From Swiss-Prot:
Keyword tags: FAD, Flavoprotein, Monooxygenase, NADP, Oxidoreductase
Keyword tRNA-binding: no
Residues of the site described as Transition state stabilizer: R325
Protein name, UniProt field: Baeyer-Villiger monooxygenase
Originating species: Parvibaculum lavamentivorans (strain DS-1 / DSM 13023 / NCIMB 13966)
Sequence positions that bind FAD: F12, E32, W41, D52, Y58, V104
Function: Catalyzes a Baeyer-Villiger oxidation reaction, i.e. the insertion of an oxygen atom into a carbon-carbon bond adjacent to a carbonyl, which converts ketones to esters or lactones using NADPH as an electron donor. Besides cycloalkanones, can use cyclic alpha,beta-unsaturated ketones as substrates, leading to enol-lactones. Can also act on methylated cycloalkanones and methylated cycloalkenones with high enantioselectivity in some cases.
Use case: This enzyme offers a promising route for the synthesis of chiral enol-lactones, when expressed in an engineered strain deprived of enone reductase activity.
Documented EC number(s): 1.14.13.-
PANTHER family per the UniProt record, alphabetical: L-ORNITHINE N(5)-MONOOXYGENASE-RELATED
Length: 514
């Protein structure tokens, strides 16, 4: 069973990889662990699961795809995106070369034959010259180590392991642990149904207003005259969105003018307020504060209890604004004004122990019928090192990254020839719009395989020195910004792609080709 490339993952990256490599004449197979395509949208069927990337933006720029597809709303839910991947599948004939239910579990490089020997958990083995890993950001849920967690008598699941058959909150006492992006969404749905909802917060999220909007086929057809421009523009912005920042400095502009821009951005919604402000919002602490202070007053107005507002929207920010990828929200702050909703600050009242009747903080037991763990996911290193990958260096990938992620171009790792990862560590990833990085990173991969086909090279390996230099470039770029003040994603897709494309133009410097 020999192939030019075996792709693991049937999200945007892997779907894109399968389509383009096939088009380029590579014998290719895709192994996806779940039963259907969609990536995160296969696994995340919890109530309220929605994109943070608005329409045109969170889809492929293939003309035959967006010509004949329309969305029901500006930010579609998980089930609508599954419909989008099914439509993509019919149009591009993908699934014939996908094999579902194959979880890749171990792999080993065969230097004599410059090909990978890949093993799934069902025992199937397959040779592939190239090992293209598209496992995403969210393939390893993080469940904290609370004493007695497995003891809980009611229903509990991680948001990334929501039952495929559904589950209702109606009339139940539900507790949600974590206020990440999935927590905000879960909190929104349970707040209208649950007999009581307690939310456990370590740190207040700085949730931005979504500005959701229902959509109609008519207006979308008229807009689609602008779509080719939108898809060109999104390749050229910091995070791959169609959001142009304001080039001025927040500090070099009159205050009434800052409030004007902040109000405009606030009304367009989404990541406009994250990424569309002034140029020094994420390089200058003073400028950063102007945008936090505007969000704080917006939010504190929505909340009726000042003791709550200090917890949800503190006067001092817990970190710099916009340093982590923001969560969106529709009515998340209003839910806390309800009489059936409570907010527990795990900093003040830490969780002592999980018990069958519920969650016991330092100031009492919170009896629950269902316990939702919205505690997020391991870093992208946990989803790649979850496969047992044996490199030509004598160690596993898990072992190679125990001190931290080590890559060149965010694409490869010394000791691991003919292996490339998309949306991997030290690439834009978390700071990027998925389909935008899938397309731009994707073309980089295809070009790389074509270059080796054209030049009779059967082997590529990042060098230890290029690995070292790459880390120094990340630290120097991120050292010019506030991002290291977060609790790594390469900041800047154009800066990123420019380095990648230029290494390729010098015949893949930093790699050894054989
Ligand atoms: C709820 C939620 C909403 C999000 N919304 C957005 C958004 O709006 N915009 C955005 O840019 N990003 C979003 N993200 C982050 C998201 O991970 C990336 O955006 C992106 O879409 C990742 O796409 P992907 O192709 O890289 O992989 P994913 O879509 O993450 O999928 C990876 C696939 O790999 C498969 N796989 C994993 N391990 C194995 C294995 N060992 N063997 C075989 N197969 C395996 C998995 O089953 C999974 O389907 C969101 C994440 C979550 C959790
Ligand atoms: Mg060899």
């Amino acid at each position: 069973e020999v192939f030019d490339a075996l792709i693991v993952g049937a999200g945007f990256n892997g779907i894109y990889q399968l389509h383009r490599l096939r088009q380029e004449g590579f014998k290719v197979r895709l192994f996806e662990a779940g039963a259907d395509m969609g990536g995160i949208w296969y696994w995340n069927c919890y109530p309220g699961a929605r994109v943070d990337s608005h329409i045109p933006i969170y889809e492929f720029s293939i003309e035959e795809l967006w010509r004949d597809w329309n969305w029901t709303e500006r930010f579609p839910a998980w089930d609508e995106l599954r419909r989008y991947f099914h439509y993509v599948d019919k149009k591009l004939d993908l699934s014939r070369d996908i094999r579902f239910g194959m979880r890749v579990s171990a792999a080993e490089f065969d230097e004599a034959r410059d090909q990978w020997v890949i093993r799934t958990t069902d025992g199937t083995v397959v040779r592939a010259r190239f090992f293209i890993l598209c496992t995403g950001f969210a393939s390893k849920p993080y469940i904290p180590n609370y004493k007695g967690l497995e003891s809980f008598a009611g229903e509990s699941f991680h948001t990334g392991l929501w039952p495929q058959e559904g589950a209702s909150f109606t009339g139940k006492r539900v507790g949600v642990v974590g206020t990440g992006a999935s927590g905000v969404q879960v909190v929104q749905e349970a707040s209208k149904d649950a007999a009581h909802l307690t939310v456990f917060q370590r740190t207040p999220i700085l949730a931005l207003p979504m500005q959701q909007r229902k959509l109609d086929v008519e207006t979308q057809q008229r807009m689609k005259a602008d779509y080719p421009e939108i898809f060109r523009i999104r390749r050229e912005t910091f995070g791959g969105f169609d959001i142009l920042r304001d080039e001025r400095s927040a500090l070099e502009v009159p205050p009434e003018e800052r409030c004007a821009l902040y109000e405009k951005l606030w009304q367009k919604g989404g990541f406009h307020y994250w990424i569309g402000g002034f140029s020094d919002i994420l390089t200058n602490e003073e400028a950063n504060r102007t945008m936090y202070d505007f969000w704080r007053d917006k939010t504190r107005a929505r909340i009726k209890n000042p003791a709550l507002a200090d917890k949800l929207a503190p006067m001092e920010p817990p970190h710099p604004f916009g340093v982590k990828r923001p969560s969106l929200e529709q009515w998340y702050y209003e839910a806390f004004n309800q009489d059936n909703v409570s907010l527990v600050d795990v900093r003040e009242m830490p969780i002592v122990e999980i018990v069958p009747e519920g969650v016991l903080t330092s100031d009492g037991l919170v009896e629950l019928d269902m316990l939702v763990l919205a505690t997020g996911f391991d870093a992208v290193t946990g989803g790649l090192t979850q496969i047992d990958i044996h490199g030509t260096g004598g160690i596993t990938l898990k072992e190679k990254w125990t001190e931290g992620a080590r890559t060149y171009l965010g694409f490869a790792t010394s000791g691991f020839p003919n292996m490339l990862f998309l949306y991997g560590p030290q690439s834009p990833s978390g700071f990027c719009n998925g389909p935008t990085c899938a397309e731009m990173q994707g073309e980089w991969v295809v070009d790389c395989l074509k270059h080796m086909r054209e030049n009779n090279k059967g082997r590529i390996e990042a060098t230890a020195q290029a690995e070292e230099e790459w880390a120094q470039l990340l630290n120097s770029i991120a050292g010019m910004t506030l991002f290291p003040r977060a609790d790594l994603n390469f900041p800047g897709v154009p800066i990123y792609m420019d380095q990648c494309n230029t290494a390729a133009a010098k015949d893949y410097e930093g790699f050894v080709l054989d």
